[PDB]
């Protein structure tokens, strides 16, 4: 009940920090994916 499973209290443990850093890296690699594919990354045509 006071663990990191609940969304609010999760941010206290640095495991949340590590997880978000890693998922940020594995999201930012998608930018290089779009770089290779020649597509558009600098803008999003959804929910502007």
């Amino acid at each position: 009940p006071y663990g990191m499973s609940t969304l609010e209290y999760s941010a206290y443990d640095p495991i949340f920090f590590i997880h978000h850093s890693n998922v940020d890296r594995q999201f930012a690699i998608w930018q290089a994916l779009q770089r290779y594919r020649g597509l558009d990354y600098n803008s999003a045509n959804c929910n502007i």
Binding site: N45, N47, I48
Partner: peptide, 30 residues
């Protein structure tokens, strides 16, 4: 009757791309 507006959420916006008669002028704009 003017019904509520909560039963419909916020509309989203999106964009899609696609596929004689002489007239003397000033010397500054020349």
């Amino acid at each position: 009757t003017q019904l509520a507006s909560s039963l419909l959420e916020s509309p989203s916006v999106s964009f899609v791309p696609g596929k004689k008669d002489v007239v003397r002028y000033e010397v500054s704009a020349l």
